Amino acid sequence: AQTVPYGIPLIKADKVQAQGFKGANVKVAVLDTGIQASHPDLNVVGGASFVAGEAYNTDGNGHGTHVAGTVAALDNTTGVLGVAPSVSLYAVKVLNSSGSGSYSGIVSGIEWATTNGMDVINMSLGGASGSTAMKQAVDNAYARGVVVVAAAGNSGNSGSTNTIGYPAKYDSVIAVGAVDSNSNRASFSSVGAELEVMAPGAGVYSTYPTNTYATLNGTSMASPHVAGAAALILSKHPNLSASQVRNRLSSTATYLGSSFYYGKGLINVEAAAQ
Ligand SMILES: [Ca+2]
């Protein structure tokens, strides 16, 4: 049978899906370690690899497949359920089997995405330092109308230290923090002034390499939740611009506390979709 991860009802992705909007026609590119394209519960329609010696349609890590599953796990009688199960999935490998990648490889992914007409870009990756090349590509995609979502980082908090990584730290990028099934901020969810919105990141069950499913923890899992809500909103009002979709996301979020810890709050797709 098909399992419904707690994450989708928590963010009200089901009320919208129920209304009939599942993110169809929306092109979502997942910049990650690739995707097990042959996964039964997934439907990758294309992409590209910028990692030497590795094809975009294979995931030797499991990370990119899990993230992808959260965005568009097929709505059928098996596996799990994605936020926008009808979204046009694209895998852009910018990380290798060890979860590592170079700035050139990543920006190249951000450039291919925008150039090829992606509506949403998910980056469940992050680093301590940014780069003028990374900033440009990101501001560019956003400038072109591309919604850019990135994991806020998993370095928890310490005193009053802003621990939000890059590219999450960029203004053109939406930073995502993680909360558990009780809607309580996860201990690893980084904090900072740039934290934008919260989504399920603890105990999220999704698709995992070699036709299986696994549970993982991280802000990397919270991100796809927001990347998929964006497509959901886009599949309802396709005329909206990035900044608009973005604003409905944070302007209708459920308040959970100080922005330094929860940003604007937990996202609500039913409210954000008008
Ligand atoms: Ca399924």
3 state DSSP class of 67: helix
Tokens of 83: 């936020």
| Pairwise CA distance, residues 141 & 121, whole Å | 9
CA–centroid distance, 67 to ligand 1, in Å, is 14
Tokens of 127: 């680093």
Pick out the residues of the known binding site for Ca(2+).
2, 41, 74, 76, 78, 80, 168, 170, 173
Q: What residues form DSSP beta bridges with 215? A: 205
Resolution (A): 2.3
Contacts of 132 (CB under 8 A, 6+ apart): none
Q: Do 246 and 147 form a contact (C-beta atoms < 8 A)?
A: yes
49 flagged as catalytic: no
Q: Do 51 and 101 form a contact (C-beta atoms < 8 A)?
A: yes
| Pairwise CA distance, residues 99 & 259, whole Å | 30
Domains observed in the chain = 1-274 (3.40.50.200)
Q: What residues form DSSP beta bridges with 27? A: 88
* Catalytic residue of the set 124, 189, 206, 220: 220
Residue of 183, 195, 65, 179 lying closest to 126 (CA atoms): 195
CA–centroid distance, 147 to ligand 1, in Å, is 25
